[PDB]
């Protein structure tokens, strides 16, 4: 077949019931994740190839970066609770990987302050049980598939994108193959 298990995607041995339809995992420490954001805009390009209104979910992971990795999962929970993902994604990626100015939880908070989130609002979210539950939700989704690598995308809890099987001589062709694979998997 044109699309084959092991080429553009793999199939989970144990599918996850009730999973998000399109579920992405990333780390702000992850170099390909930085590219998926700033260079390729994978999430945007997948969204454009899917029907309007499809639920896309994006979660942070703990397993890169030790203490700060977990702080960043909690900060991503704050971003989701406040709805400010689009305001903080690029400065968090650049703070961790480009300028390397993010070395502590306080430095993460600085990114939100600079992006216009009030200190009181950030701190109240950071310490809220709503955010505690969002941290648990991110961990559970990753645990459901023993995730050991990012960037990762899962479709309907059943299929995992396999970017290592896609063309990388051309960045736009790669994005198109990735997005068309998501569309194919979503229609299975
Ligand atoms: C999870 C461990 C890493 C393996 O998974 C990959 C392999 C290659 C790529 C490229 C290529 C590009 O666009 O420059 C973008 O993301 C990738 C993820």
- Nearest atom (ligand 1) to Cα of 32: 16
Q: Name which residue sits closest to atom 1 of ligand 1, judged by CA.
A: 149
- Nearest atom (ligand 1) to Cα of 149: 1
- Report the separation in Å between the CA atom of 121 and the middle of ligand 1, taken as the mean of its atom positions: 36
Which two tokens mark 54?
């499809």
* Contact yes or no for 161/150 (Cβ under 8 A): no
Candidate of 40, 168, 176 to mutate for ligand 1, largest count of ligand atoms within 8 Å of Cβ: 168
Written in H, E and C, the secondary structure of the chain is CCCCECCCEEECCCCCCCCCCEEEEECCCCHHHHHHHHCCCHHHHHHHHCCCCCCEEEEECCCCCHHHHHHHHHHHHHHHHHCCHHHHHHHHHHHHHHCCCCCCHHHHHHHHHHCCCCHHHHHHHHCCHHHHHHHHHHHHHHHCCCCCCCCEEEECCCEEECHHHCCCCCHHHHHHHHHHHHHHHHCC
Candidate of 41, 147, 164 to mutate for ligand 1, largest count of ligand atoms within 8 Å of Cβ: 164
Ligand 1 is surrounded, with C-beta below 6 A, by 32, 35, 149, 163-164, 168, 174
| Domains detected in the chain | 1-188 (3.40.30.10)
- CA-CA distance, 27 to 72, in Å (whole number)? 8
Place of tokens 């339809």: 21
Q: Name which residue sits closest to atom 18 of ligand 1, judged by CA.
A: 163
- Pairing of β 159-161 and β 22-26: unpaired
Angle at 91 between CA 86 and CA 92, to 5 degrees: 95
Which two tokens mark 182?
């998501």
* Contact yes or no for 97/28 (Cβ under 8 A): yes
Technique employed here was X-ray
Which two tokens mark 107?
């430095």
- Pairing of β 22-26 and β 56-60: parallel
Candidate of 40, 64, 163 to mutate for ligand 1, largest count of ligand atoms within 8 Å of Cβ: 163
Which two tokens mark 59?
């979660």
Q: Name which residue sits closest to atom 11 of ligand 1, judged by CA.
A: 168
- CA-CA distance, 166 to 177, in Å (whole number)? 7
Among 180, 159, 172, which Cα is nearest to 50's? Answer: 180
Q: Name which residue sits closest to atom 14 of ligand 1, judged by CA.
A: 168
- Nearest atom (ligand 1) to Cα of 174: 13
Which two tokens mark 142?
């990753």
């Amino acid at each position: 077949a044109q699309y084959e298990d092991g080429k553009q995607y793999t199939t989970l041995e144990k599918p996850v019931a009730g999973a998000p339809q399109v579920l992405e995992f990333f780390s702000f420490f992850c170099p390909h994740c930085y590219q998926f954001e700033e260079v390729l805009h994978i999430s945007d390009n997948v969204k454009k190839k899917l029907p309007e209104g499809v639920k896309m979910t994006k979660y942070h992971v703990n397993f890169m970066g030790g203490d700060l990795g977990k702080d960043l999962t909690q900060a991503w929970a704050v971003a989701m609770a406040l709805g400010v993902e689009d305001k903080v994604t690029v400065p968090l990626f650049e703070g961790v990987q480009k300028t390397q100015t993010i070395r502590s939880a306080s430095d993460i908070r600085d990114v939100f302050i600079n992006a216009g989130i009030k200190g009181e609002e950030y701190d109240a979210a950071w310490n809220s049980f709503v955010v505690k539950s969002l941290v648990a939700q991110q961990e559970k989704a990753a645990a459901d598939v023993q995730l050991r690598g990012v960037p990762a995308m899962f479709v309907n809890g059943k299929y995992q994108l396999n970017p290592q099987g896609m063309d990388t001589s051309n960045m736009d062709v790669f994005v198109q193959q990735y997005a068309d694979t998501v569309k194919y998997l979503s229609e299975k």
